[PDB]
Design an enzyme around this catalytic site. Sequence first.
Site, PDB file in Angstrom:
ATOM      1  N   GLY A  20       0.772  -1.222   0.000  1.00 25.52           N
ATOM      2  CA  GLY A  20       0.000   0.000   0.000  1.00 25.52           C
ATOM      3  C   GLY A  20       0.807   1.277   0.000  1.00 25.52           C
ATOM      4  O   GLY A  20       0.652   2.089  -0.911  1.00 25.52           O
TER       5      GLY A  20
ATOM      6  N   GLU B  97      25.301   7.985 -16.336  1.00 27.07           N
ATOM      7  CA  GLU B  97      25.601   7.323 -17.595  1.00 27.07           C
ATOM      8  C   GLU B  97      24.659   6.168 -17.870  1.00 27.07           C
ATOM      9  O   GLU B  97      24.424   5.841 -19.040  1.00 27.07           O
ATOM     10  CB  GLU B  97      27.042   6.831 -17.600  1.00 27.07           C
ATOM     11  CG  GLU B  97      28.040   7.943 -17.628  1.00 27.07           C
ATOM     12  CD  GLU B  97      29.448   7.457 -17.814  1.00 27.07           C
ATOM     13  OE1 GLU B  97      29.624   6.279 -18.179  1.00 27.07           O
ATOM     14  OE2 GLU B  97      30.383   8.248 -17.586  1.00 27.07           O
TER      15      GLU B  97
END
EC number: 3.6.5.-
Lengths: 428, 428, 426
Positions: free
Chosen positions: B135, B245
């Site tokens: 939840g 990267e």
Amino acid sequence: MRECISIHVGQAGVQIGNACWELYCLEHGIQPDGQMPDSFNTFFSETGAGKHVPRAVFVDLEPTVIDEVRTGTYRQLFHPEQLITGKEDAANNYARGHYTIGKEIIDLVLDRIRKLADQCTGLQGFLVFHSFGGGTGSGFTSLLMERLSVDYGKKSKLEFSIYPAPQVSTAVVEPYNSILTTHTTLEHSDCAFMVDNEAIYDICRRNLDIERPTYTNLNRLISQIVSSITASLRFDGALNVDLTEFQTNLVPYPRIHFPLATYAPVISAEKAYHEQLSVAEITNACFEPANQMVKCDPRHGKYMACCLLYRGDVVPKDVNAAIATIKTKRSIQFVDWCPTGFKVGINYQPPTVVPGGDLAKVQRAVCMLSNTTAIAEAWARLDHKFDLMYAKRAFVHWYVGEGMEEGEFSEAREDMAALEKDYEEVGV
Amino acid sequence: MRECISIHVGQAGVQIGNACWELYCLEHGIQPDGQMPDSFNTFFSETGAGKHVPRAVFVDLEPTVIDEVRTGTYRQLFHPEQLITGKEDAANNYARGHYTIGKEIIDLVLDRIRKLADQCTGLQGFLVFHSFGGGTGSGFTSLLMERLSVDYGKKSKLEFSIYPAPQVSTAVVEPYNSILTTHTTLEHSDCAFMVDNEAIYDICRRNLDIERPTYTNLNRLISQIVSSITASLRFDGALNVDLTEFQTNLVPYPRIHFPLATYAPVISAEKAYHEQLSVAEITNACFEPANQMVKCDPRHGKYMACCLLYRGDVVPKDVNAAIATIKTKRSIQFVDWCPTGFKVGINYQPPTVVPGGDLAKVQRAVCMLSNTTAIAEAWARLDHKFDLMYAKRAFVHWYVGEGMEEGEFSEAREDMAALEKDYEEVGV
Amino acid sequence: MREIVHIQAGQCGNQIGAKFWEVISDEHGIDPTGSYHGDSDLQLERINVYYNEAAGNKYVPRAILVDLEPGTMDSVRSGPFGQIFRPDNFVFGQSGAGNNWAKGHYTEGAELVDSVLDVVRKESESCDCLQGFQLTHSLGGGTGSGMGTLLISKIREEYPDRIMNTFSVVPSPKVSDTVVEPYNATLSVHQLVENTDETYCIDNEALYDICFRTLKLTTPTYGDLNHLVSATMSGVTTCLRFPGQLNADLRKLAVNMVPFPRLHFFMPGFAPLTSRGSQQYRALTVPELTQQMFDAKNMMAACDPRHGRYLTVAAVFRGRMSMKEVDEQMLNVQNKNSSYFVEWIPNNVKTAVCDIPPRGLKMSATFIGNSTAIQELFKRISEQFTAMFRRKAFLHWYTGEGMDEMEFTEAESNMNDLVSEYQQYQ
Ligand SMILES: CC(=O)O[C@H]1[C@H]2[C@H]([C@@H]3[C@@H](O)[C@@H]4[C@H]([C@H](C)C[C@]5(O)OC(=O)[C@@](C)(O)[C@]45C)[C@@]3(C)[C@H]1OC(C)=O)[C@@H](O)C(=O)[C@H]1C[C@@H]3O[C@@H]3[C@H](OC(C)=O)[C@]21C
Ligand SMILES: Nc1nc2c(ncn2[C@@H]2O[C@H](COP(=O)(O)CP(=O)(O)OP(=O)(O)O)[C@@H](O)[C@H]2O)c(=O)[nH]1
Ligand SMILES: Nc1nc2c(ncn2[C@@H]2O[C@H](COP(=O)(O)OP(=O)(O)OP(=O)(O)O)[C@@H](O)[C@H]2O)c(=O)[nH]1
Ligand SMILES: Nc1nc2c(ncn2[C@@H]2O[C@H](COP(=O)(O)OP(=O)(O)OP(=O)(O)O)[C@@H](O)[C@H]2O)c(=O)[nH]1
Ligand SMILES: [Mg+2]
Ligand SMILES: [Mg+2]
């Protein structure tokens, strides 16, 4: 060489002065006997052989509060003809503290003020601690300020007033006293800083992790603020101010003299271990609205002047860097007709810690005095309550039976409407 | 001089963060007191005199998981304003985390992120740890990613997400939360690495020969993977990457950013004595399907991008030889529009061992990340489960009583159909 | 009297420049603190090409170091020979490129290039009369390709009458190290066809093959490959610093090597490179150096030199040698295999001889070749590019930073124009 006379009137003044004189006697190494086992001449007077009497006058109408000072740990300290007491109290009734009860004590306290102002050479100004809601702290304060402005001319005269909280209240005849007092003292004081009870309650809950604070913690914080104001007079620094600077730097028009005060850093002994408190951090913590000592929000107004007072290990380069990076943010907006809106002071001696207190040891500390337009909103609330208790003529007979006609309430209401109009004018 | 801020949400993220900060304190020599008897700057902030506090925020809606951290042996490590809790859990209800209960917390955690990110000068990105089947781990993650992508703009935002398994499941309403959070987080995350419970159960069963693993062993392996990702920042190596990267090498189209991670060599102390662990062995052995930490079949899809991170005593010549002899085999097949499909990073510092643990001392270590088209099949499974519990409107009234209409379920299933057609499109 | 300034950009260029300054400072005989301790006199009379005098016989290099993350800067500064450089020549950013060409050229390079060009302009004002510049970078990433391209273009618009060399390693045929590598290669080559005077092509794979088949190493690092590259650089520029019998500086090699102004992509080599075991089993004669120069498995770029023809060859010998032997052997190896040389250029080979060898060698030689078979390398970039550019893969990381698709089609047309000019002359 340059001196100050501190007057405490009323119960709030006596207890704030108790905390203030405990802090002063701890800062200069003085014992409660008066002997220390030289800058203290700006507050003290040497009496014969190693005995220092302070320059303070404690006056009150009820002999219960002062007679705990005369049997506390400072019995030896104050001179016995300085703790002046009455016989019956004002009973939260400004008409008693201005007209009937107060006018048999005022000559004696003015003779003591005249006698203590002759033992100086370079007298710079007075300092009056008082409340707003109370009886003697409003009526006797306004009568004392009227007589001081008549007799002593163009010397400085500062104040420390307790601002009434919006939701939290004790008395019921309180806004009567507030509007009458702010009307009467509007032509005689020079500057007056504000503190509120509810903001200091929230500060001690959130920051210091105190869940049930009594009045000692609040008086310790107020004493830290007064100490940070006067520590530019008691020591030496790189960039120092004195008491005749503030009225030139913070009060543009001669009826806007209510700035509000803030202290930083206020943290516990636990969360101080895990933090590095540099100058940029404490400069930013001075400016966020959860740390103000008056329950109003500076986001709902614009700043007119700001004054910072630093203490400890600070260099001026990153002080200037911190004020520079404050002035670019949009959260904070300054007024249009004031591009240079800062006054910077730097002192060398760090703040000390009273043992048994709640504060921690820090090297650097800031005290901010801000003159902003948010306080107009607070005036609005107080004004509205006046109308409710003037809608039905409630509690008016207590005042008119003691020497005050009915038109004085109308005069005070008109002058507070004029002050709200002046704030709205210079703001909008 | 270049940092990362890591946020942990929900129980699975908090416990993975427990193991991660245990490992990061064990690597750099920092005790749980926060004092060591400068690379750690990228994770720890120096506080005054020999105290390094972590750059982490712990947040959950239920106070029973953070309290064990506030009372256990890392009591002295974290800043006590960085361990934020609520009063009532989300109760496996995505609408209670995104809409109703989860909105009384987010101003506080955004203030803590803003107050931690002003102490940086080279901030490179975030790291959010959470699950899918729960939840607050789905709802609070989606709402926090919305606020972070609005506020912090073009910085890289990674996530580490627990993927739901085919057979092993705990909740009954898992696919609802998974479909809703995959629809919502698809527009603000940059790369989200997937790990599974059942594949780590099989890795611990077959390789490590552990027949009953608890959650601690799984969190140790996840901590080893995240440490191997960030060791290119905490150390100095020959051919080294940073956090920006990864997205430029593994994300061809801006909605295919679900790669799966792998670590090698994972063995016991009994098989470590009988084999030399060459770079060619671990490079061929991270490319076998019985080591992939998500329960899927990599033989049933073709690869799009791969990223290999080496640690320890490796030289680049047999690294390139091992990648070359990978690309000659027939079963390990790459996609047509990508002839160059490998990105190589090499670090110097070997992996450290935790005492009382289960991993063996080795010099070389490989982490692998793979972006492939096999996981589409896994997506298909989840959608089929959704369809069955959408044929009868089961468990929907718990969602629609907390502030979610019946249109969002059709919208989210539409976007899952769109993503399945996108994977099949770029595959075929 | 002719001075050179040195600019290193990227990670790969930073490592190769660090090993280059270690090699050069060992050759001229100065300590890692900058004090002179040489044993000859000829090590100091021509030192002005690389160093500056500074306040009590300490000599500082004329080097400029630039990168977008401070990691390789601090790693170069902390190591040995790190206290030589001047601390104002370390310029860096805080952000990082992320192996985007566009993030290097357009997004962070636009803020760093002002400070870099201010330092270049001050070092150029301090010199007397410079020969030119040189830059070390790689055609595979984002800092190297993007910002070396940007700095090359700014320097050509400021100083248009000098010689600007580049020592750039290029992408490898079999195995890569970045997924977006041919994008960066094609855009950087599209700028370097125009804005430079000569460019030397180095592979990482051919360096591994020299390290395996000839040097017979078991464990090579990156230090050995950067030492090989630095040996070739010093062998190229040795005729400026020591007196020789027949000498040739940089502009002489420019005039001799490139016939048409766009064909300036060479392949270098060094000799002698021997093993430790078979060192004592061979001679030191000029035929052995010459046969090791004109050899296929010695070339520092993965192009088979007998897949085309040679345009022009330059050979820089070092030591005390005899010129009849040199010229007879260039004649011999030119008429031995005449099919690998251009028919309409007679006597392709250019010869230079310097007197003072490398530190620890009796004799050495440097080879530089300008051949047609380098077209093969360019073919295998462009087709790879078209594969990704047939599908717009990985493109939005570049398009989000300020480029269009027309720039990519422009660069592909430029590189195919270059392959057409290479196929023209064979
Ligand atoms: C082939 C040979 O013996 O060369 C060695 C170097 C020496 C290299 C030395 O620096 C080694 C290198 C090793 C092969 C690699 C090395 O460990 O890693 C490095 O960074 C090197 C190159 O500096 C290290 C430390 C060595 C052994 C070797 O460098 C190589 C092989 O690239 C080098 O220091 C010298 O002084 C050379 C002097 C005489 O020229 C010969 C030798 O160089 C050549 C190529 O001819 C050297 C003795
Ligand atoms: N000869 C060397 N080549 C290297 C070295 N380090 C990396 N490389 C090569 O560089 C390539 C990987 O990226 P590059 O370094 O070229 C791009 P760079 O790192 O300079 O830019 P950034 O993206 O800003 O980091 C790849 O072809 C490697 O073989 C080195 O030390 N020596
Ligand atoms: N911050 C602070 N406020 C106080 C303190 N003591 C009283 N007050 C406030 O003072 C107000 C009550 O009026 P008082 O100042 O006590 O009246 P007085 O000065 O004793 O004069 P009398 O009417 O004669 O009793 C209330 O708002 C109190 O909250 C204190 O110690 N610290
Ligand atoms: N590897 C690992 N997986 C866990 C752990 N705890 C729970 N999971 C998985 O998470 C899923 C259960 O949902 P939770 O993540 O616990 O929900 P939550 O994050 O606690 O949020 P709440 O509903 O508010 O309690 C299951 O798939 C679990 O296998 C853990 O400690 N380690
Ligand atoms: Mg009283
Ligand atoms: Mg929970």
